[PDB]
Write a protein that binds this ligand. Structure first.
Ligand SMILES: *[C@@](O)(C(=O)NCc1ccccc1)[C@H](C[C@@H]1CCNC1=O)NC(=O)[C@H](Cc1ccccc1)NC(=O)/C=C/c1ccccc1
Ligand SMILES: *[C@@](O)(C(=O)NCc1ccccc1)[C@H](C[C@@H]1CCNC1=O)NC(=O)[C@H](Cc1ccccc1)NC(=O)/C=C/c1ccccc1
Lengths: 306, 306
């Protein structure tokens, strides 16, 4: 029993973190095989960020313009290239701790674990959703750039995020491990701001299923809803519209609990209209949207407490 | 910016987890140097838990009654002894991944990271407070016994918890790495239940300091309070009484923000009496008590957003 915001175990990723310095700028990199990946802004000063031309800034560097430290060992850089908003530094040593891995671009609403790092040293691990607005509500300070987000499936690490910047509202923006930003953000000083965000409806429903698996039914009701009538309420409450593909994804949770999706929708509608009346669900007084349907199946028992 | 329930990076602990089987019972162990630690109930069946005599159950085992698997390798057991509610299995191989470590008994209100494990394989990591009632609100399923809690200071792992059981309310109980239970619980079937719990007042105040460091002051007020008048309100709201030693602990946070402790107490009093009026603090609609003063200093910037 219990339900916690759980991260994946971080050791396979810890063994990949290094420090990258160019000039007076230092941040973290990710060392897999004989490549180090890092935010391309390592080549900039604070003034350069006001209007950087990365191609022009980079051509002025050599391989020895970059210092890479892995623990206490210096790794020699023997090649460099830009890929979108990252650099790919070739190094003289292949990482012996390289796990099985791949690069994935995750989608809005999906969750991942962040290994916060400073100076190549890991400091903490936490779980994050990718918001509909393509931000994350992280916890990052100066020096955290190049910290990575990841999921683990079997013993394969799927890297999906590298940290680049904080926006004015205090939320965080970054790239996939091809260097393509999530969202419309750019690695230069602008008036950029997080777009309006939405609640991740699919996750809310998944978390209500978790609450039933773990033995609680208080918020269920005798009603049902159409998808469309449900969406009219959703729009009023700044929830994402639910689709049939979402309904299908909730199949396995629906089956485990015996509650049809649209009957769980009607329970959510009631919760939205009436509130929770001073009650909690899985310990929370609000509706939680940072657990996906897969997160619930991973964590919860496969036997409902009936 | 941001503030998240952050765990320590788990790799130093992952490299220590094994599987321990005795008879038909399988659970996890912790392998440091040439010892494996595990819950002594590995020697019991379900019927034995109704009234186990551990001394009598154990004398009937040999070394080869225990099978220890570390990844895919079998480790031979060459000695065994009971220590309180754990076994200490001696093995034929010293763990080459043994970190720098120590065993600590943590105190009520202090926080730690849990590495949930099944069959010797780590599955997730999350942060937990030790409740005043000597329980943790974890997330554990069958097979998680022997999962450990820990803190990391420099590169030293301080192990403080090993998991043994779930109580009827769904919260979790266990031991330190000497095998002494936290709280009044016993490793046998009884009518045992979690005592009434309390809110961890010191942590609430620490988290209000975090909110000021991160730039928010809405809940402050022009008033001050005596310690005693503050405690009269605390008792009415099921908060732990605040003491002078708590006040002292909050010194460094008080200084960083320029808010005296007792003036922060008066802001809490007002919050308790009046509520939060539909507002949030660090994203939360409730007062959070699972971050210690040290947790706040570790995570927050050392420069207040004034
Ligand atoms: C990274 O750690 C980092 O890159 N530091 C090095 C650096 C290089 C060149 C110029 C400036 C800095 C850092 C992480 C941030 C810092 C605070 N919280 C974190 O998440 N990233 C930055 O400092 C970036 C640099 C940048 C990237 C893309 C576009 C413009 C700038 N800037 C920001 O993150 C700005 C944050 C901010 C927050 C509040 C008020 C003003 C500015
Ligand atoms: C452990 O994984 C475990 O030890 N499993 C092996 C075992 C050996 C011998 C007898 C029984 C089981 C497990 C972890 C629990 C299971 C569910 N969530 C977890 O945290 N621990 C238990 O199963 C213990 C065994 C026990 C220890 C101390 C005193 C009595 C029994 N029991 C419980 O945890 C009971 C839980 C429970 C929950 C709801 C309703 C009834 C019982």
């Amino acid at each position: 029993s219990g339900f916690r915001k759980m991260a994946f175990p971080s050791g396979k990723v810890e063994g990949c973190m290094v420090q990258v310095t160019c000039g007076t700028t230092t941040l973290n990199g990710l060392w897999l095989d004989d490549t180090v990946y890092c935010p391309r802004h390592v080549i900039c000063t604070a003034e350069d960020m006001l209007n950087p031309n990365y191609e022009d800034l980079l051509i002025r560097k050599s391989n020895h313009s970059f210092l890479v430290q892995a623990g206490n060992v210096q790794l020699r850089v023997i090649g460099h290239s830009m890929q979108n908003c990252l650099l790919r530094l070739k190094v003289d040593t292949s990482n012996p701790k390289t796990p099985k891995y791949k690069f994935v671009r995750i989608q809005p609403g999906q969750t991942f674990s962040v290994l916060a790092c400073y100076n190549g040293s890991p400091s903490g691990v936490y779980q994050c959703a990718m918001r509909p607005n393509h931000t994350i509500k992280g916890s990052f300070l100066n020096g955290s750039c190049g910290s990575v987000g990841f999921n683990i499936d079997y013993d394969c690490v799927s890297f999906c995020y590298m940290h680049h910047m904080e926006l004015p509202t205090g939320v965080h923006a970054g790239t996939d491990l091809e260097g393509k930003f999530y969202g419309p953000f750019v690695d230069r000083q602008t008036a950029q701001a997080a777009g309006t965000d939405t609640t991740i409806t699919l996750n809310v429903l998944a978390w209500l299923y978790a609450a039933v698996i773990n033995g609680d039914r208080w918020f269920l009701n005798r009603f049902t809803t159409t998808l469309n009538d449900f969406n009219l309420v959703a729009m009023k409450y700044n929830y994402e519209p639910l689709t049939q593909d979402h309904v299908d994804i909730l199949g396995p949770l629906s089956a485990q609990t015996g509650i049809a999706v649209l009957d769980m929708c009607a329970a959510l509608k009631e919760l939205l209209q009436n509130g929770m009346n001073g009650r909690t669900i899985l310990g929370s007084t609000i509706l939680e949207d940072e657990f996906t349907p897969f997160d619930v199946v991973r964590q919860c028992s496969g036997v409902t407490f009936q």
